[PDB]
């Protein structure tokens, strides 16, 4: 008769929706975490009671799922999940009124970083903005002190670009050109060439990427003199699936580009909070899925359950140390007080998980960023950035340049290449 600590799982789970493979993909990782937490009975005398509700990756259904969970479910202490950017935003907005701390393992939208609108929202996955401090370190490493930017006119990318301004504060790097586009990038690319830009920081989707590199080919903005740094989250063979130019020319312009994205798992062989290495966990994860499919967010879901478990432990310590010393089972609902204790407990998260050191800063994950480079036909891993330590590690003998040296941020070294 051990009292439950109920948590509201929100995610797409139905096969009738595309992104529903993320929900099903992370569930084995989730259960592994939950199994261990029960075996060791870390939440004594309580137990973790995760309930799952399908958002069907839809605003109306997602909110109905949320409201039905509240109206007719047990008392949930916090929310776990939120995958689709718009559904997560609508739910996250109404958290404070409900005293519900939310932890997401998949919503990467930069919109949720606004802790004035989303004060009760946390996430274990690095956001789309997390690439900026990573990029800054790459720029300083190669001494690229002059960059141009190319942003697509969509909130997703506009907000990343805007975050970049704050990241490049008193840093000895200037944005010598800022260009925009909605449906045609060629004008903006032509402008960058005229402005003599050599290092381009791109923020656009994979459909536009094809157009960008097509313009780059005709504008000759590729090869030894140029360096494109763009999103690293495009599908493996995104160029195969493709505009104005031949596929071979598109490949010639793509060659050497750097992709930036979150790293799915840590590459350190250190023992994590579970007692396992990121490699040991990965192998144990692939056993449970049994061909059900993989999600790149599984490590973040796994660490997520550990965050929740540790948060609840700390919440009990705070209650037990208070003057009224109320018990979790004493709250008829998650009230203002309980929500604040949970919120503060989560803010204190600091442990080593399978995705590296799990630490928040204003609800945003301080995680590791993966650098890739397009070599020949596919993206290859060339380094990683540690957000906690502000560390950039480039892998030896991977990152290459078409000239015998990295391109200079301007014209002053053309006679070389």
Residue 61 in tokens: 């259904």
**192: DSSP letter:** H
Residue 134: closest CA among 334, 375, 394, 405:
394
- Phi and psi dihedrals of 299, rounded to 5? -65, -35
**Burial call 210-221: b when 16+ CB within 10 Å, e when fewer:** bbbbbbbbebeb
DSSP structure string for 96-151: GGGT-EEEESS---GGGG-TTT-TTEEESSPPGGGHHHHHHHHHHHTT--EEEEEE
Strand pairing partners for 81? 10
- Whether residue 45 is preceded by a cis peptide bond, meaning omega within 30 degrees of 0, is yes
Instruction: Please tell me the distance from the alpha carbon of residue 92 to that of residue 120, in angstroms, as a whole number.
Output: 7
**3: DSSP letter:** P
Residue 29 in tokens: 């990782």
Distance from the Cα of residue 398 to its chain's centroid: 24
Tell me whether the CATH fold assigned to 1-126+268-367 matches the one assigned to 127-267+368-417. Answer: yes
- Phi and psi dihedrals of 88, rounded to 5? -60, -40
- Pairing of β 101-104 and β 121-123: parallel
Count of residues making up the chain:
417
Count of helix runs (H) and strand runs (E) in the chain: 11, 16
Q: Which residues contact 106 (CB under 8 A, 6 or more apart)?
A: 11, 22, 26, 81, 82, 83, 125, 297, 300, 301
Domain residue spans in the chain?
A: 1-126+268-367, 127-267+368-417
Q: Strand order of the sheet with strand 47-54? A: 47-54, 4-11, 78-81, 101-104, 121-123
**Burial call 268-292: b when 16+ CB within 10 Å, e when fewer:** eeeebbbebbbeebbeebeeebeee
Contact (CB, 8 A) for 112 and 82: no
Residue 208 in tokens: 């536009």
What method did the depositors use to determine the structure?
A: X-ray
Return the CATH superfamily for domain 127-267+368-417.
Response regulator (3.40.50.2300)
Instruction: Please tell me the distance from the alpha carbon of residue 186 to that of residue 216, in angstroms, as a whole number.
Output: 8
Distance from the Cα of residue 4 to its chain's centroid: 31
Strand pairing partners for 351? 358
Residue that is written with structure tokens 């250190």 in the block: 270
What is the resolution in angstroms? 2.4
Strand pairing partners for 80? 9, 103
- Phi and psi dihedrals of 84, rounded to 5? -75, 130
Instruction: Please tell me the distance from the alpha carbon of residue 138 to that of residue 410, in angstroms, as a whole number.
Output: 17
**Burial call 125-162: b when 16+ CB within 10 Å, e when fewer:** bbbbbbbbbbbbbbbeebebbbbbbbbbeeebbebbbe
Query: Would you tell me the crossing angle of helices 20-39 and 298-321 to the nearest 10 degrees?
Result: 50
- Phi and psi dihedrals of 302, rounded to 5? -60, -55
- Just give the CATH number of 1-126+268-367: 3.40.50.2300
Instruction: Please tell me the distance from the alpha carbon of residue 188 to that of residue 244, in angstroms, as a whole number.
Output: 16
Cα-trace Rg, the chain: 23
Instruction: Please tell me the distance from the alpha carbon of residue 412 to that of residue 414, in angstroms, as a whole number.
Output: 6
């Amino acid at each position: 008769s051990s009292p439950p600590l109920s948590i509201m799982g929100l995610m797409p789970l139905t096969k009738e929706v595309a992104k529903g493979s993320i929900g099903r993909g992370v569930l084995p990782a989730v259960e592994l975490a939950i199994e261990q937490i029960r075996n060791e009975s870390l939440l004594r005398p309580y137990f973790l009671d995760l309930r799952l509700y399908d958002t069907e990756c839809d605003n109306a259904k997602g909110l109905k799922a949320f409201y039905d969970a509240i109206k007719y479910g047990p008392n949930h202490l916090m929310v776990f999940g939120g995958v689709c950017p718009s559904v997560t935003s609508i739910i996250a907005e109404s958290l404070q009124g409900w005293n519900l701390v939310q932890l997401s393992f998949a919503a990467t939208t930069p919109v949720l970083a606004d802790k004035k609108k989303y004060p009760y929202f946390f996430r274990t996955v690095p956001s789309d903005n997390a690439v900026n401090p990573a990029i800054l370190k790459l720029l300083k490493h190669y001494q690229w002190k002059r960059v141009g930017t190319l942003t697509q006119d969509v909130q997703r990318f506009s907000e990343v670009r805007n975050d970049l301004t704050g990241v490049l504060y008193g840093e000895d790097i200037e944005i010598s050109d800022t260009e925009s586009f909605s449906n045609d990038p060629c004008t903006s690319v032509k402008k960058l060439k005229g402005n003599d830009v050599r290092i381009i920081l791109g923020q656009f989707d994979q459909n536009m990427a094809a157009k960008v590199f097509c313009c780059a080919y005709e504008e000759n903005m590729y090869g030894s003199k140029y360096q494109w740094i763009i999103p690293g989250w495009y599908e493996p063979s995104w160029w195969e699936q493709v505009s104005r130019c031949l596929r071979k020319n598109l490949l010639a312009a793509m060659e050497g580009y750097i992709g930036v994205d979150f790293e799915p798992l840590s590459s350190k062989q250190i023992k994590t909070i579970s007692g396992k290495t990121p490699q040991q966990y990965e192998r144990e994860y692939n056993n449970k899925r049994s061909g059900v499919g993989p999600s790149k967010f599984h490590g973040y879901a796994y660490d997520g359950i550990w965050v929740i478990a540790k948060t609840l432990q700390r919440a009990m310590e705070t209650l037990h140390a208070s003057s009224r010393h109320q018990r979790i089972q004493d709250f008829n609902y998650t009230d203002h007080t309980l929500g604040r204790i949970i919120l503060n407990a989560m803010n204190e998260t600091n442990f080593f998980g399978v995705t590296g050191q799990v630490v928040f800063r204003n609800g945003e994950r301080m995680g590791t960023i993966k650098f890739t480079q397009f070599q020949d036909s596919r993206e290859v891993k060339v380094g990683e950035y540690n957000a906690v330590a502000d560390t950039l590690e480039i892998i030896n003998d991977t990152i290459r340049f078409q000239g015998s040296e990295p391109p200079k941020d301007d014209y002053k070294d053309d006679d070389d290449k």
